[PDB]
Amino acid sequence: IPKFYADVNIHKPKEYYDYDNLELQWNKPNRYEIMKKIGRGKYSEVFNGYDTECNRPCAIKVLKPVKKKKIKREIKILQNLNGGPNIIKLLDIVKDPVTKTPSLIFEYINNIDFKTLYPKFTDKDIRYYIYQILKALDYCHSQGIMHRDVKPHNIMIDHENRQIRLISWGLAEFYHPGQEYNVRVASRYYKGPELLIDLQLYDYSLDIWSLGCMLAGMIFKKEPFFCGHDNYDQLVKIAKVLGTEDLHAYLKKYNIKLKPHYLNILGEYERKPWSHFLTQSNIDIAKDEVIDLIDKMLIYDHAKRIAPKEAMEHPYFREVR
Ligand SMILES: Nc1ncnc2c1ncn2[C@@H]1O[C@H](COP(=O)(O)OP(=O)(O)OP(=O)(O)O)[C@@H](O)[C@H]1O
Ligand SMILES: [Cl-]
C-alpha cells in the first residue's frame, strides 16, 4: 500500500490509463528542420531540430519499428504529465507520409554529459537539482505514474539556464494496486531490490531507490554506486553495503523465497556505515544532511522508503527559493 497516491488511477476515468485504446493524430513532419544527431537509444535516434513555424528549438526522437503498444503508452504518459515541474514537454507527434516512420517532437534541453557536468557542480548545485528531480517525481506519482528508469542518463541539465528535465518516459507505467509489473526494467545499477528479488507488486517507491543510487553516486563521487557484474551480483553489491539482516527481514515480511542461485553467492554482511564511502575528493559535498537523506532512500523495504513529497521537506534543502 503506497503511503501516497495509491488510488490515483482508481478515481481517474479509464481513458486516462487505457493507452492501447488511444487514437493518435500524427502530423506532417515538414515544419521540423532536422539537424545534428544528439542521442542514440535502444529503438530511437534523437536529433537537434527546429520548429520553423513556431520559432522554437526541439529534440526530434525518430522511432525504430516498435509495437504501437509501447509508443501509445509513452505518448499517453507524456500527455498526462504536460506542465509538470521539470518534466519534458511533448510538443508534437509526427509521421513521415512515405516511410510511415513515427517521430516524437520534444522541447529541446541543451544537455552536457553528466560525466563532464556533475564534477563541475557545487554543494548548492546538487542541492537544487536533486530538489527539482524530487518535484518531477512527486508530480508523476500524484498523476498515478512510475518513471521506472531514473538514472543520471535520463536527467537533462542546461546548467547555464538552471533548466532541468526528467526524460525517457518509454519505460514509465501507470500504478494500479494489485497489478504485477515487469521486474525487467531500469539499469541494473539503479534497479531496486524488489526488481532483483522478483517482487512484481512494486510501486512508486522504485523511483526513490533509483534516485537514492543517483544521489549516493553524485555526493560519494562513485557512479554507478552499486556496480554488479550480473542481476544476482547486483543484490550482493547492495547487501555488502545495507547488510543482510535487513534483507532477510525484508524477504520474510513480503514472503519472498530467493532463487537456488542467490543462496550460494549471498553471504552474511554487516551494514557498512555511510562514513566508509568518504574520500579526500568528496568530504566537501558528502556532509551529514545529505547522508541522512541517502539513508532514508536506500532502504530494502520499499514501503519504508521516504516519499519525494517528504524528501523535499528534509533540512538538506533549505529552499526559501
Ligand atoms: N529533449 C531532449 N533534449 C536533449 N537531449 C535529448 C532530449 N530527448 C532525448 N535526448 C537525448 O537522446 C538520448 C536518448 O533519448 P531518450 O532517452 O528519450 O530515448 P530512449 O527512450 O532511450 O529510446 P527508445 O525508447 O526508443 O529505446 C538521451 O539520452 C539524450 O541525450
Ligand atoms: Cl542483467
Numbering used by the authors: 12 to 332
Text taken from the publication that reported this structure:
Here, as a first step towards this goal, we report the bacterial expression, purification and crystallization of an enzymatically inactive mutant of PfCK2α having the mutation D179S and its crystal structure bound to ATP at 3.0 Å resolution. A significant improvement in crystals quality was obtained when the inactive mutant PfCK2αD179S was used. The structure was refined to Rwork /Rfree = 0.192/0.231 at a resolution of 3.0 Å. Clear electron density was visible for all three molecules (named A, B, C) present in the asymmetric unit, allowing unequivocal assignement for of all main chain and a majority of side chain atoms for the polypeptide chain up to residue 328. A residual difference electron density map at a level of 5 σ allowed unambiguous building of the bound ATP for each of the three molecules present in the asymmetric unit. Here, the ATP moiety is bound in the active site in the absence of divalent metal ions (Mg2+) that are seen to coordinate the phosphate groups in nucleotide binding proteins, indicating that the energy contributions of active site residues are sufficient for substrate binding. Based on the conformations adopted by these three elements, the present crystal structure reveals that PfCK2αD179S most resembles an active conformation. Six amino-acid substitutions are observed at the ATP binding site between the human (Arg43, Leu45, Glu55, Val66, His115, Val116) and Plasmodium enzyme (Lys47, Ile49, Asn59, Ala70, Tyr119, Ile120), giving rise to subtle alterations of the shape of the ATP binding pocket. The loss of the interaction between the α-phosphate and Asp149 results in the triphosphate moiety being buried more deeply in the PfCK2 catalytic cleft, making ionic contact (distance of 3 Å) with Lys81. This closer contact formed with the “IGRG” motif (residues 49–52 of PfCK2) by the ATP molecule displaces the β1 strand from the conformation it adopts in the active human enzyme.
